[PDB]
Amino acid sequence: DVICYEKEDVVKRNNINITGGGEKTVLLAHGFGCDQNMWRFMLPELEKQFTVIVFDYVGSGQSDLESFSTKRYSSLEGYAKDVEEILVALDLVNVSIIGHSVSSIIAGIASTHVGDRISDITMICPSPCFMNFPPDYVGGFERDDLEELINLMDKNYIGWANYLAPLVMGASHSSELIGELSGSFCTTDPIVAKTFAKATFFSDYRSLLEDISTPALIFQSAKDSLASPEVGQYMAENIPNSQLELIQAEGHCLHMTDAGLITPLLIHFIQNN
Ligand code: NA
Secondary structure, three states, rough: OOOOOOOHHHHOOOOEEEEEEOEEEEEOOOOOOHHHHOOOHHHHHHHHEEEEEEEOOOOOOOHHHHHHHOOOOHHHHHHHHHHHHHHOOOOOOEEEEEEHHHHHHHHHHHHHHHHHHEEEEEEEEEOOOEEOOOOOOOOEEEEHHHHHHHHHHHHHHHHHHHHHHHHHOOOOOHHHHHHHHHHHHHHOHHHHHHHHHHHHHHOOOOOHHHHHHOEEEEEEEEEEOOOOOHHHHHHHHOOOOEEEEEEEEOOOOOHHOOOHHHHHHHHHHHHOO
């Protein structure tokens, strides 16, 4: 069963903030090394149509670190527990979840436990798995390169941030943007960041996909170091009821760089599913 905390309890624990208005509610879930502030480019349009709920994963942003554990948050199932607990505790129903990157998988795990409160998922630049299993799956990242990334976190954290920020944001983008991500990386507790990075880039959730029965809208970045169009394509083929749209853009953060491209589309999806 899913624990039900006092509404009062999850709010402070997850730094929950509610804006907009109306009966239809959307829940926005951030990606690795970020927080709810990365949604600020989409919020205004979303708030014209929905009640918008944002939050910080325990350990992330301004969430309560007192709730963080390396045990629970060792894998994405502990993150999914965050979502399941917020939905149960606020007793929300008919929620559309919009997830960035890893939150695409987290939302999907949560939908296997509390599917009854979730109407659909929107997945922005998702990946089920970053490693390669050729020929039939190429996550795009060799084990040797991933080993080197996680290890760089131990040797030189500032170096790690400077390397990964442009990778995720897309090197063609502004210093303001890339720099915002490296700053977020830097201000995130190093143990949270290290265990979240392993749970994100070292996991394999391809077998999950066929068990996601919730309608899923996938946005695939046309040029994405972290996830090629074949990754998005693979996902749509395996999530039973899914729909992929390819977006002409660069980087792994379309909700930040190209909110104008994806927002009207996901709004239409959530309104008419
Ligand atoms: Na609506």
